[PDB]
Ligand binder design. Structure first.
Ligand code: CA
Ligand code: CA
Ligand code: CA
Ligand code: CA
Ligand code: CA
Ligand code: CL
Length: 357
């Protein structure tokens, strides 16, 4: 059916990219279709199924954004306020001049991509933030930053008077029914935890690290990510405040060339060419500063857009696409870090084959 469109495209993709296993969710009005392909671990051959956990890498950032947005809806976090208003340990630093919004849109003054090696824990991280000098004009330049979205998670946790993961669990994951979503995979689920395969065909699994939970640490199922997508598409029955928080994550905040930066979510007006999508996931967007123009007639969530986010670790590659105007979404998780361009092509062919574009 829907499977007749999906199955050949994923077979072709997994063959071409030598991906051991995939889990895919297709979200539409009148329902969600879950499909599993291949092996969760190439070296045991254990199949991908309902319980298989995939590393989603930077897709974790969408959950971080959602929690921040919920704190904002609850009146506990002001997105345009200086981050030092909620983390007074950073008073007198650059974070007097950088907001939660800047952090959620990668416009925090050129804040760098990676946590530096001299930062090993929360104390050394805060010391590093206190000393750091902005290298770009705050709110006028975008640099993709684990440090920034990480700090947004810490700011959110402070504003909610709780710790990041328990707070995430209580306020976002549990209400969405995301009960297969883990920051630290329990012993009892280790048999479900897919093994990654890197670009050389070697097994690999993500290591813990500072700001891991906020930036890249989730292991989850396609089905759980589909719940977050369903809610984004107004197809879920969720509490009003959570729904509002989720809707606000899709508000466009900056124009960045052809891309609109929402709260972590990245979006494009329809029709969108795949080449534009590809440009969004390459060196020039991800590894250079890009000029960013605040959207000052501040836009409402749009119904005529391609909304997306990639996520990877060394051994995994995930992609989410949402088409709010079609009430359709796609979640693709793989245990190989395969090229972003191939993620775009496969998503586009699936969605075109389904008539959604
Ligand atoms: Ca304000
Ligand atoms: Ca390092
Ligand atoms: Ca952690
Ligand atoms: Ca204004
Ligand atoms: Ca092609
Ligand atoms: Cl990092």
């Amino acid at each position: 059916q829907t499977r007749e469109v999906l199955d050949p495209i994923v077979a072709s993709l997994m063959e071409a990219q030598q991906i051991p296993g995939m889990a895919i969710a297709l979200v539409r009005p009148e329902g969600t279709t879950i499909s599993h392909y291949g092996a969760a671990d190439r070296e045991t051959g254990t199949p991908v199924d309902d319980d298989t956990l995939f590393e989603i890498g930077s897709l974790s950032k969408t959950l971080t954004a959602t929690l921040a947005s919920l704190a904002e809806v609850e009146g506990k976090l002001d997105f345009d306020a200086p981050v030092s208003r909620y983390l007074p340990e950073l008073e007198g630093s650059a974070f007097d001049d950088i907001s939660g919004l800047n952090l959620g849109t990668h416009t925090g003054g050129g804040l760098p991509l990676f946590v530096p090696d001299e930062v090993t824990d929360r104390a050394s991280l805060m010391a590093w933030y206190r000393e750091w000098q902005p290298t770009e004009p705050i709110g006028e330049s975008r640099t993709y930053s684990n440090l920034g979205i990480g700090l947004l998670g810490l700011e959110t946790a402070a504003s909610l008077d709780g710790e990041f993961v328990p707070t995430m669990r209580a306020k976002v994951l549990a209400p969405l029914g995301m009960q297969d979503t883990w920051y630290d995979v329990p012993e009892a689920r280790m048999a479900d935890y897919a093994m990654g395969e890197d670009k050389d065909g070697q097994p690999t699994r993500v290591s813990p690290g500072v700001l891991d939970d906020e930036a890249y640490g989730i292991k989850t199922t396609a089905a759980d990510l589909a719940k977050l997508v369903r809610a984004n598409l107004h197809l879920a029955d969720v509490d009003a405040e959570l729904q509002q928080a989720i809707d606000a994550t899709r508000q466009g905040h900056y124009r960045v060339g052809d891309m609109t930066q929402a709260l972590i979510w990245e979006q494009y007006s329809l029709p969108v060419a795949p080449e534009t999508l590809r440009a969004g996931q390459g060196y020039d967007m991800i590894l250079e500063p890009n000029a960013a123009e605040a959207l000052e007639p501040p836009q409402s969530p749009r119904d005529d857009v391609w909304v997306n986010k990639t996520g990877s670790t060394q051994g995994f590659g995930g992609y989410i696409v949402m088409l709010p105007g079609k009430h359709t979404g796609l979640v693709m998780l793989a245990n190989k870090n395969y090229p972003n361009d191939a993620r775009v092509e496969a998503a586009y062919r699936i969605l075109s084959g389904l008539g959604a574009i």
